[PDB]
Amino acid sequence: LLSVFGVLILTLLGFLVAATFAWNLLVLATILPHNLVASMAVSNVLVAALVMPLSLVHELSGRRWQLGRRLCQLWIACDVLCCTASIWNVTAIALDRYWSITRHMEYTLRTRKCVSNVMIALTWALSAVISLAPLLFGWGETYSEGSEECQVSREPSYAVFSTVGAFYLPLCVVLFVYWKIYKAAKFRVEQKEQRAALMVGILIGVFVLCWAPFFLTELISPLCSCDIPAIWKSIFLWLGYSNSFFNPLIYTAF
Amino acid sequence: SHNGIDCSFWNESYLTGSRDERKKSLLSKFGMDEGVTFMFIGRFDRGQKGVDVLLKAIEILSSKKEFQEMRFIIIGKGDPELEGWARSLEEKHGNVKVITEMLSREFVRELYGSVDFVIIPSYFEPFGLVALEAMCLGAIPIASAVGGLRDIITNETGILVKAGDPGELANAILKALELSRSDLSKFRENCKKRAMSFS
Numbered sequence: 001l002l003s004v005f006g007v008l009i010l011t012l013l014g015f016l017v018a019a020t021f022a023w024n025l026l027v028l029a030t031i032l033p034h035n036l037v038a039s040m041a042v043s044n045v046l047v048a049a050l051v052m053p054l055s056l057v058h059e060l061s062g063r064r065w066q067l068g069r070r071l072c073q074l075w076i077a078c079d080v081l082c083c084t085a086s087i088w089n090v091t092a093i094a095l096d097r098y099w100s101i102t103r104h105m106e107y108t109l110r111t112r113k114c115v116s117n118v119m120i121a122l123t124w125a126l127s128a129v130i131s132l133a134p135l136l137f138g139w140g141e142t143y144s145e146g147s148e149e150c151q152v153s154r155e156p157s158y159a160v161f162s163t164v165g166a167f168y169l170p171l172c173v174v175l176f177v178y179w180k181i182y183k184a185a186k187f188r189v190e191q192k193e194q195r196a197a198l199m200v201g202i203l204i205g206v207f208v209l210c211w212a213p214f215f216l217t218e219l220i221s222p223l224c225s226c227d228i229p230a231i232w233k234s235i236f237l238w239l240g241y242s243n244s245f246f247n248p249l250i251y252t253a254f
Numbered sequence: 255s256h257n258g259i260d261c262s263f264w265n266e267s268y269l270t271g272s273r274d275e276r277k278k279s280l281l282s283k284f285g286m287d288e289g290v291t292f293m294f295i296g297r298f299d300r301g302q303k304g305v306d307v308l309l310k311a312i313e314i315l316s317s318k319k320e321f322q323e324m325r326f327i328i329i330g331k332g333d334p335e336l337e338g339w340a341r342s343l344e345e346k347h348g349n350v351k352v353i354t355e356m357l358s359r360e361f362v363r364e365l366y367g368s369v370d371f372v373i374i375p376s377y378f379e380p381f382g383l384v385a386l387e388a389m390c391l392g393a394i395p396i397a398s399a400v401g402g403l404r405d406i407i408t409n410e411t412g413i414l415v416k417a418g419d420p421g422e423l424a425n426a427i428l429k430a431l432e433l434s435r436s437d438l439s440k441f442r443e444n445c446k447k448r449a450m451s452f453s
């Protein structure tokens with residue numbers, strides 16, 4: 001029948017949310033550039049713990065948002081904040097590896113520590129200002145009203161602001177550094193640095209591959225795609241969310 | 255390249271037998287027998303690689319009882335006076351061997367893999383390639399605290415001394431001779447991990 005498969009897959013996704021949480025927590029535990037690792041794992045723990053469960057019940061299964069509408073804003077803010085933070089943590093790690101390969105000379109432990117701490121602080125600052133953006137800049141509301149459903153504000157200005165801030169800018173950074181990183185990963189100017197390059201390159205590839213369907217179909221909707229089935233919208237969303245699970249699997253594989 | 259070390263060449267697995275057996279076999283071919291072995295490998299020159307400091311340290315050490323227990327292998331060529339001074343010390347003592355020909359990488363690997371102590375008395379070293387090659391095969395480093403040598407060597411990885419000072423080097427060789435206990439094995443493996451950390 002119909003909903004039997006649906007229950008089975010919902011149970012699987014709940015298991016996936018829990019495995020995401022646990023694996024990132026394990027990587028966090030073994031730590032305490034390990035501060036960038038810690039920052040990324042923190043953002044992915046927050047995704048799996050705050051973002052994913054609520055999306056799993058509401059957007060993916062179908063139960064309607066009878067929860068307090070004053071917390072709909074908090075769930076949206078957590079989603080935006082944590083996914084932006086995870087994307088930019090991957091790109092900060094990418095910048096660190098590109099500066100290890102190309103800028104080998106001036107990147108001493110002092111300089112590297114300084115730059116990685118600045119990047120972590122900046123990552124979380126930009127995630128905040130992107131998430132809680134229409135509040136200080138105060139040009140609208142963060143949820144889409146007129147809906148008995150909890151959906152992000154699809155107002156054009158915030159949409160451009162958040163997607164360029166969360167996906168397209170970090171995508172441009174990673175597409176700038178990916179050439180040298182891939183070359184290093186293939187030994188094209190010793191085994192440890194090659195292993196490092198390969199891990200980072202795989203992380204970038206899975207990030208791009210995991211988040212590109214959602215953001216790409218989020219840009220083509222406002223251009224005549226007035227009917228993209230929300231089933232595939234949710235599939236693309238959760239494919240983005242699975243990046244939070246693939247990053248641990250990739251890190252613990254090296 | 256980026257001056258990394260090839261972990262697939264500088265590895266002990268290429269070598270046959272036990273480390274003590276290799277050290278005994280190597281000493282035998284120089285008319286010497288079991289002692290605590292020190293090694294220098296580099297160009298002979300004033301002011302850069304520090305063979306002068308090492309020669310002076312050896313002259314200092316020559317007067318003490320512990321000198322009977324040491325063995326020294328100097329490997330290189332260069333400034334003729336340094337070569338003659340080295341030959342002079344080789345002739346005065348049977349625990350000192352000097353090699354002035356260029357040696358193959360495989361042979362030098364076999365050396366690093368039995369010699370148990372490499373002295374790197376450099377005035378300035380950019381990369382410390384010799385220190386990594388030695389460490390990857392268990393040789394414990396005794397280097398001057400300059401350049402990338404201090405980056406590579408930590409509290410529990412070797413001995414550091416002030417560059418250019420012969421007495422400090424001779425004292426370091428004395429401390430390392432004092433250091434000769436089974437603990438050497440621990441001290442070796444630290445090196446081998448740290449060297450892999452610079453692959």
Ligand SMILES: NC(N)=NC(=O)N1CCc2c(F)ccc(-c3c(F)cc(F)cc3F)c2C1
Nearest residue numbers: 055079080083084152153154159162166218
């Ligand atoms: N569970 C559901 N539906 N999550 C979402 O839609 N996100 C969560 C992740 C995210 C982001 F990290 C950065 C920006 C956006 C975003 C967008 F893609 C379109 C907009 F119009 C406004 C936005 F802020 C999102 C969207």
